[PDB]
Design an enzyme around this catalytic site. Structure first.
Site, PDB file in Angstrom:
ATOM      1  N   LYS A 165      12.144   9.861  20.477  1.00  0.00           N
ATOM      2  CA  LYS A 165      10.676  10.660  20.519  1.00  0.00           C
ATOM      3  C   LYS A 165       9.842  10.152  21.211  1.00  0.00           C
ATOM      4  O   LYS A 165       9.447   8.983  20.904  1.00  0.00           O
ATOM      5  CB  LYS A 165      10.527  10.744  18.941  1.00  0.00           C
ATOM      6  CG  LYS A 165      11.847  11.668  18.166  1.00  0.00           C
ATOM      7  CD  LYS A 165      11.401  11.917  16.951  1.00  0.00           C
ATOM      8  CE  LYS A 165      12.252  12.840  16.063  1.00  0.00           C
ATOM      9  NZ  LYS A 165      13.682  13.268  16.627  1.00  0.00           N
ATOM     10  N   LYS A 216      -5.584  -4.580   0.698  1.00  0.00           N
ATOM     11  CA  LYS A 216      -6.400  -4.376   1.846  1.00  0.00           C
ATOM     12  C   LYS A 216      -6.894  -5.463   2.403  1.00  0.00           C
ATOM     13  O   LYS A 216      -7.532  -6.106   1.880  1.00  0.00           O
ATOM     14  CB  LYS A 216      -7.161  -2.926   1.641  1.00  0.00           C
ATOM     15  CG  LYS A 216      -6.324  -1.881   1.300  1.00  0.00           C
ATOM     16  CD  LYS A 216      -7.265  -0.541   1.343  1.00  0.00           C
ATOM     17  CE  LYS A 216      -6.841   0.744   1.323  1.00  0.00           C
ATOM     18  NZ  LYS A 216      -7.827   1.854   1.583  1.00  0.00           N
ATOM     19  N   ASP A 267      -1.565   7.185  -7.802  1.00  0.00           N
ATOM     20  CA  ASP A 267      -2.053   7.294  -6.330  1.00  0.00           C
ATOM     21  C   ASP A 267      -1.060   8.268  -5.481  1.00  0.00           C
ATOM     22  O   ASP A 267      -0.181   8.852  -5.989  1.00  0.00           O
ATOM     23  CB  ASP A 267      -2.342   6.040  -5.862  1.00  0.00           C
ATOM     24  CG  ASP A 267      -3.400   5.824  -4.568  1.00  0.00           C
ATOM     25  OD1 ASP A 267      -3.320   6.417  -3.545  1.00  0.00           O
ATOM     26  OD2 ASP A 267      -3.838   4.653  -4.565  1.00  0.00           O
ATOM     27  N   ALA A 268      -1.092   8.011  -4.163  1.00  0.00           N
ATOM     28  CA  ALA A 268      -0.120   8.980  -3.448  1.00  0.00           C
ATOM     29  C   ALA A 268      -0.195   8.063  -2.061  1.00  0.00           C
ATOM     30  O   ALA A 268      -1.160   7.872  -1.529  1.00  0.00           O
ATOM     31  CB  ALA A 268      -0.463  10.403  -3.165  1.00  0.00           C
ATOM     32  N   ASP A 310       0.803   4.095   1.369  1.00  0.00           N
ATOM     33  CA  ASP A 310       1.334   4.864   2.493  1.00  0.00           C
ATOM     34  C   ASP A 310       2.096   3.977   3.552  1.00  0.00           C
ATOM     35  O   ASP A 310       2.971   4.424   3.900  1.00  0.00           O
ATOM     36  CB  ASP A 310      -0.026   4.864   3.383  1.00  0.00           C
ATOM     37  CG  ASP A 310      -0.794   6.145   2.901  1.00  0.00           C
ATOM     38  OD1 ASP A 310      -0.582   7.303   2.413  1.00  0.00           O
ATOM     39  OD2 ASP A 310      -2.227   5.894   3.048  1.00  0.00           O
ATOM     40  N   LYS A 311       1.886   2.735   3.486  1.00  0.00           N
ATOM     41  CA  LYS A 311       2.580   1.647   4.131  1.00  0.00           C
ATOM     42  C   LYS A 311       4.056   1.678   3.634  1.00  0.00           C
ATOM     43  O   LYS A 311       4.859   1.636   4.350  1.00  0.00           O
ATOM     44  CB  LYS A 311       1.987   0.396   4.387  1.00  0.00           C
ATOM     45  CG  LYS A 311       2.188  -0.003   5.760  1.00  0.00           C
ATOM     46  CD  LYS A 311       1.001   0.695   6.652  1.00  0.00           C
ATOM     47  CE  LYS A 311       1.498   0.499   8.117  1.00  0.00           C
ATOM     48  NZ  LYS A 311       2.472   0.941   8.739  1.00  0.00           N
ATOM     49  N   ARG A 371       0.244   7.793   7.875  1.00  0.00           N
ATOM     50  CA  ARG A 371      -1.357   7.776   7.552  1.00  0.00           C
ATOM     51  C   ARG A 371      -1.697   6.397   7.773  1.00  0.00           C
ATOM     52  O   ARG A 371      -3.174   6.414   7.302  1.00  0.00           O
ATOM     53  CB  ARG A 371      -1.276   8.293   5.919  1.00  0.00           C
ATOM     54  CG  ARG A 371      -0.984   9.648   5.673  1.00  0.00           C
ATOM     55  CD  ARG A 371      -1.972  10.783   6.194  1.00  0.00           C
ATOM     56  NE  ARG A 371      -3.337  10.472   5.358  1.00  0.00           N
ATOM     57  CZ  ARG A 371      -3.305  11.191   4.167  1.00  0.00           C
ATOM     58  NH1 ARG A 371      -2.640  12.418   3.835  1.00  0.00           N
ATOM     59  NH2 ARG A 371      -4.441  11.022   3.489  1.00  0.00           N
ATOM     60  N   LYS A 372      -1.396   5.662   8.466  1.00  0.00           N
ATOM     61  CA  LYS A 372      -2.002   4.330   8.958  1.00  0.00           C
ATOM     62  C   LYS A 372      -1.869   4.049  10.311  1.00  0.00           C
ATOM     63  O   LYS A 372      -1.198   2.992  10.852  1.00  0.00           O
ATOM     64  CB  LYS A 372      -1.279   3.167   7.939  1.00  0.00           C
ATOM     65  CG  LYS A 372      -1.727   3.304   6.570  1.00  0.00           C
ATOM     66  CD  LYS A 372      -3.081   3.014   6.428  1.00  0.00           C
ATOM     67  CE  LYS A 372      -3.607   3.376   4.818  1.00  0.00           C
ATOM     68  NZ  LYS A 372      -3.979   4.698   4.620  1.00  0.00           N
ATOM     69  N   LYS A 395      10.905   7.935  13.059  1.00  0.00           N
ATOM     70  CA  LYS A 395      11.317   8.582  14.244  1.00  0.00           C
ATOM     71  C   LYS A 395      12.140   7.630  15.197  1.00  0.00           C
ATOM     72  O   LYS A 395      11.843   6.604  15.443  1.00  0.00           O
ATOM     73  CB  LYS A 395      10.100   8.841  15.071  1.00  0.00           C
ATOM     74  CG  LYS A 395       8.984   9.859  14.297  1.00  0.00           C
ATOM     75  CD  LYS A 395       7.871  10.144  15.042  1.00  0.00           C
ATOM     76  CE  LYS A 395       6.587  11.220  14.304  1.00  0.00           C
ATOM     77  NZ  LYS A 395       5.660  11.295  15.213  1.00  0.00           N
ATOM     78  N   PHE A 407      -7.828  -5.609  -9.931  1.00  0.00           N
ATOM     79  CA  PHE A 407      -6.797  -4.761  -9.352  1.00  0.00           C
ATOM     80  C   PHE A 407      -5.556  -5.318  -9.750  1.00  0.00           C
ATOM     81  O   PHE A 407      -5.003  -5.927  -8.980  1.00  0.00           O
ATOM     82  CB  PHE A 407      -7.280  -5.087  -7.722  1.00  0.00           C
ATOM     83  CG  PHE A 407      -6.302  -4.269  -6.876  1.00  0.00           C
ATOM     84  CD1 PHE A 407      -5.256  -3.370  -7.193  1.00  0.00           C
ATOM     85  CD2 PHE A 407      -6.616  -4.323  -5.415  1.00  0.00           C
ATOM     86  CE1 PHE A 407      -4.701  -2.686  -6.381  1.00  0.00           C
ATOM     87  CE2 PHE A 407      -6.106  -3.647  -4.754  1.00  0.00           C
ATOM     88  CZ  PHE A 407      -4.829  -2.695  -4.852  1.00  0.00           C
ATOM     89  N   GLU A 449      14.362  15.795   8.921  1.00  0.00           N
ATOM     90  CA  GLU A 449      15.769  16.205   9.264  1.00  0.00           C
ATOM     91  C   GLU A 449      16.378  15.049  10.115  1.00  0.00           C
ATOM     92  O   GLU A 449      15.742  14.275  10.828  1.00  0.00           O
ATOM     93  CB  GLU A 449      15.364  17.148  10.413  1.00  0.00           C
ATOM     94  CG  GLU A 449      16.779  17.685  11.124  1.00  0.00           C
ATOM     95  CD  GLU A 449      16.640  18.964  12.425  1.00  0.00           C
ATOM     96  OE1 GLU A 449      16.377  20.234  12.047  1.00  0.00           O
ATOM     97  OE2 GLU A 449      16.641  18.651  13.549  1.00  0.00           O
ATOM     98  N   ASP A 485       6.477  10.291  20.691  1.00  0.00           N
ATOM     99  CA  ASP A 485       5.421   9.655  20.144  1.00  0.00           C
ATOM    100  C   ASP A 485       5.471   8.092  19.984  1.00  0.00           C
ATOM    101  O   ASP A 485       4.367   7.486  19.823  1.00  0.00           O
ATOM    102  CB  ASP A 485       5.266  10.171  18.673  1.00  0.00           C
ATOM    103  CG  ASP A 485       4.630  11.537  18.726  1.00  0.00           C
ATOM    104  OD1 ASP A 485       4.040  12.111  19.419  1.00  0.00           O
ATOM    105  OD2 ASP A 485       4.880  12.334  17.387  1.00  0.00           O
ATOM    106  N   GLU A 514      10.510  11.602   6.813  1.00  0.00           N
ATOM    107  CA  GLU A 514       9.020  11.656   6.183  1.00  0.00           C
ATOM    108  C   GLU A 514       9.486  11.072   4.669  1.00  0.00           C
ATOM    109  O   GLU A 514      10.333  11.449   4.230  1.00  0.00           O
ATOM    110  CB  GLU A 514       8.524  13.177   6.201  1.00  0.00           C
ATOM    111  CG  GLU A 514       8.651  13.891   7.613  1.00  0.00           C
ATOM    112  CD  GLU A 514       7.630  12.900   8.495  1.00  0.00           C
ATOM    113  OE1 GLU A 514       7.170  11.884   8.224  1.00  0.00           O
ATOM    114  OE2 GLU A 514       7.136  13.846   9.583  1.00  0.00           O
ATOM    115  N   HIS A 520       0.813  -1.033  -0.059  1.00  0.00           N
ATOM    116  CA  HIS A 520      -0.044   0.064   0.046  1.00  0.00           C
ATOM    117  C   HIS A 520       0.949   1.269   0.108  1.00  0.00           C
ATOM    118  O   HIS A 520       1.965   1.207   0.777  1.00  0.00           O
ATOM    119  CB  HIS A 520      -1.076  -0.190   1.308  1.00  0.00           C
ATOM    120  CG  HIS A 520      -1.689   1.083   1.170  1.00  0.00           C
ATOM    121  ND1 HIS A 520      -1.517   2.431   1.707  1.00  0.00           N
ATOM    122  CD2 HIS A 520      -3.108   1.293   0.905  1.00  0.00           C
ATOM    123  CE1 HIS A 520      -2.332   3.291   1.490  1.00  0.00           C
ATOM    124  NE2 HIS A 520      -3.488   2.429   1.081  1.00  0.00           N
TER     125      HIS A 520
HETATM  126 MG   LIG Z   1      -3.733   7.080   2.053  1.00  0.00          MG
HETATM  127 MG   LIG Z   2       4.308  16.092  12.338  1.00  0.00          MG
HETATM  128 MG   LIG Z   3       5.057  14.385  16.677  1.00  0.00          MG
HETATM  129 MG   LIG Z   4      -6.239   3.911  -1.539  1.00  0.00          MG
END
Ligand SMILES: [Mg+2]
Ligand SMILES: [Mg+2]
Ligand SMILES: [Mg+2]
Ligand SMILES: [Mg+2]
Ligand SMILES: [Mg+2]
Ligand SMILES: [Mg+2]
Ligand SMILES: [Mg+2]
Lengths: 378, 380
Positions: free
Chosen positions: A266, A158, A235-236, A17-18, A241-242, A262, A227, A56, A268, A43, A15
């Site tokens: 950190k 998915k 797509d993007a 995002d993954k 995002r997951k 991260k 598919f 960074e 998070d 990122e 996927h």
């Molecule tokens: Mg997405």
């Molecule tokens: Mg942020």
């Molecule tokens: Mg954060």
């Molecule tokens: Mg999608």
């Protein structure tokens, strides 16, 4: 018997995002292998024929960011435009800002924020069943693609599982699987009937205990049709995002922070890992059947601003007493969490492993936050 | 009295991730203004001196994407490299894939997924107090910067509020504010003591009801020191990285889907908006003091795969009967949701307004999902 329906989903390692989570954490792993004190906020974004890494990094390491990107993409299966990204031919934009560079108890949080940990006795790994099944079906799709069992599969897809639950005095008791959904990428070699048969017999039935499947269970298998192209093509994807797939599948709670890319100091990441360990320890020690733990931080302050324990009316002792035991047993200060959970050791793709198929409920010894701590309570 | 501490946060409109949400939704608003049937999945990322928009749009609209980016940035206050981004110097990479293009009840979901809605009687807007106070402090920081009350402010910053709660048979009863945290960007004209004074008198005291503040409330005001440059400078932002701030601040639940940059046919957005309307209606009708609602979808299927209602033991009728009333009253089919909540109407920056300081608990008429529906039930 009164029941309700609770749904969780998962996405596969292809996927888009993954994919970004996995590239972010591949970059982190490469930094920690050479320099365990690396500061990393990596990122990743992707779309047709392009991957960009940015953010960074402070490190002594020398990193081939482009090779890490292409290696990660290639190993996932993005080896041609036909599959949805050619690891060797696509554009890779390296837009990272890299620079060169301590009583642990005095290290302040690097940011504010809050984090939640959750555990439930309904599975042996103390995770919610709707989440575990969606996730394990995804991991099994990847496994049968790579081991040649179902060679028609492609990387993206998915999964989604609806579980019918009973509420036993606050404890969640699964009754049956209500609905299973899979939408998977595939090649042109397989018929719809072959896809449906192979998903049921090679993927679903090995993963879902037969006690939870019956003649009324609903199967949606590529419901929206074929598919063939997937991943970033038309797509993007983005890192982070997951985050619900990464954690508890809608169960428990989430404080908002993503994990991938991260470094473990950190909060998070370390903060969420320690409150999983806390919640899992409460349930594993028989102190409750279910547990939710919150922590929160202020930038520059070592000690958490707040901690919360709630056991959904399942605690054998009142939650105020469990909070005391948790505060006595776990050290929530950021300089301490990374040492206690051995988070900078940086071995065989230690964080890339976390970046698909969930950060929790996995019994790999690199997942140090899954190790239960003994709790004292008589 | 037995209490517990719950914390929520917020980030300001100049936070680099929030900046991306606002740019994404500015692109969506521009598309809907010309073509209400636009399909939009606009992603934005940012780092030092750069913004990139990307993703897929199907539209009849003619959009100046670069202008929307620079206007959005400039309006937030990114007007100089000293602030951390200059709208009139930075790189703008337009990497969108744009292409040209019926019984609503038969439209299948455009994806799978699940979504949660939540409401609580503990505030008049039926939102959790920890979340409301963090968010309103943020919105007030932006207001006093832009209206010239605190001209020393800059656009980036973060807020966080810890509330001490009592559990009243499942209902959440705020007792007091335990801890208030503000970390705000500022210029070089203001001393640390002026910052602390101004935040207390112009920002905190107007926003936090006096009944929740006492001599033991802890204040952390720029605790890590000065904060002069912000936004994307030496940092990075992405769309869809503030989804808990966008919703309930840790309360209720989240199914994972981001809102900004998505046209309102997308169930991640319309589905979440309708279940907020459902949860809010259950509480506003007096059926419960608190409500959580889940919905889930499958790609290509109109009817939801599952719905559930949980009132945390606060319902005045069984949750199974509230579920039946919710399913009788709300239409969760994706072609229906967009029409019932008038989401393609597209006037004065309708979605860009959602993209900072929360999608819920706001009384603006464009927030159609905040309007309570009457529910038929018999109070026992
Ligand atoms: Mg997405
Ligand atoms: Mg942020
Ligand atoms: Mg954060
Ligand atoms: Mg999608
Ligand atoms: Mg020009
Ligand atoms: Mg930040
Ligand atoms: Mg989505």
């Amino acid at each position: 018997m009164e029941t309700f329906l609770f749904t969780s989903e998962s996405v596969n390692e292809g996927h888009p995002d993954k994919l970004c989570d996995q590239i972010s954490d591949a970059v982190l792993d490469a930094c920690l292998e050479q320099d365990p004190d690396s500061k990393v906020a990596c990122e990743t974004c992707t779309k047709t024929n392009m991957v960009m890494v940015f953010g960074e990094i402070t490190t002594k390491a020398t990193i081939d960011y482009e090779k890490i990107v292409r290696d990660t993409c290639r190993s996932i299966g993005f080896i041609s435009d036909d599959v949805g990204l050619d690891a060797d031919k696509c554009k890779v934009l390296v837009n990272i800002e890299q620079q060169s560079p301590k009583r642990p108890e005095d290290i302040g949080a690097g940011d504010q924020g809050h984090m939640f940990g959750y555990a439930t006795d309904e599975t042996p790994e103390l995770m919610p069943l709707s989440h575990v099944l969606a996730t394990k079906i995804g991991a099994r799709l990847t496994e049968v693609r790579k081991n040649g069992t179902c060679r028609w599969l492609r990387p993206d897809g998915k999964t989604q599982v609806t579980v019918e639950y009973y509420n036993d005095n606050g404890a969640m008791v699964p009754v049956r699987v209500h609905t299973v959904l899979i939408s998977t990428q595939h090649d042109e070699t397989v018929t719809n009937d072959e896809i449906a048969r192979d998903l049921k017999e090679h993927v679903i039935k090995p993963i879902i205990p037969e006690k939870y499947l019956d003649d009324k269970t609903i199967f949606h298998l590529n419901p929206s049709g074929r598919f063939v192209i997937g991943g970033p093509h038309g797509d993007a994807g983005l890192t982070g995002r997951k985050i619900i797939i990464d954690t508890y599948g809608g169960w428990g709670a989430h404080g908002g922070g993503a994990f991938s890319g991260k470094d473990p100091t950190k909060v998070d990441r370390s903060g969420a890992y320690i409150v999983r360990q806390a919640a899992k320890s409460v349930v594993a020690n028989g102190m409750a059947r279910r547990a939710l733990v919150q922590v929160s931080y202020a930038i520059g302050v070592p000690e958490p601003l707040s901690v919360f324990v709630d056991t959904y009316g399942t605690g054998l002792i009142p939650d105020k007493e469990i909070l005391k035991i948790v505060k006595e047993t776990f050290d929530f200060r950021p300089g301490m969490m990374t040492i206690n959970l051995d988070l900078k050791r940086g071995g065989n793709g230690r964080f890339q492993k976390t970046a698909a198929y969930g950060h929790f409920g996995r019994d790999d010894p690199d997942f140090t936050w899954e190790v239960v701590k003994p709790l004292k309570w008589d």
